[PDB]
């Protein structure tokens with residue numbers, strides 16, 4: 259279950275996810291997963307970043323879930339669960355702004 263996951267923030271807006279992630283103490287890759295504001299059944303992976311050009315900023319990645327069963331950001335790379343997806347992206351940056359590091363503070 260995802261609702262039991264400490265990184266699952268459920269139904270919070272994009273503005274609120276940014277409010278939480280834009281904390282100067284959050285290092286690159288701080289993250290949270292929330293419901294997709296407009297795609298039913300889909301999720302959103304909001305991640306903090308930091309670079310000299312943009313300074314502290316947030317990126318949001320849409321996570322889709324098929325009825326076939328897999329979860330994915332890109333259809334090319336699928337997982338059986340949201341937890342598995344999160345674990346994979348905590349080890350690989352791939353197309354993300356940074357690998358997932360730790361759960362965003364409240």
Ligand SMILES: CC(=O)N[C@@H](Cc1ccc(P(=O)(O)O)c(P(=O)(O)O)c1)C(=O)N[C@H]1CCCCN(Cc2ccc(-c3ccccc3)cc2)C1=O
Pocket residue numbers: 271272293294295296297300301302317318319320331332351352353354
């Ligand atoms: C308006 C906004 O914030 N849109 C987001 C997507 C988003 C998606 C859904 C929802 P919700 O409605 O449905 O929730 C919200 P929101 O409004 O709630 O905030 C916000 C976005 O466009 N992010 C970018 C993030 C990285 C840059 C590229 N990109 C396309 C892309 C390119 C490469 C990869 C990639 C990643 C990993 C591996 C390989 C490639 C992924 C995406 C994005 O989508």
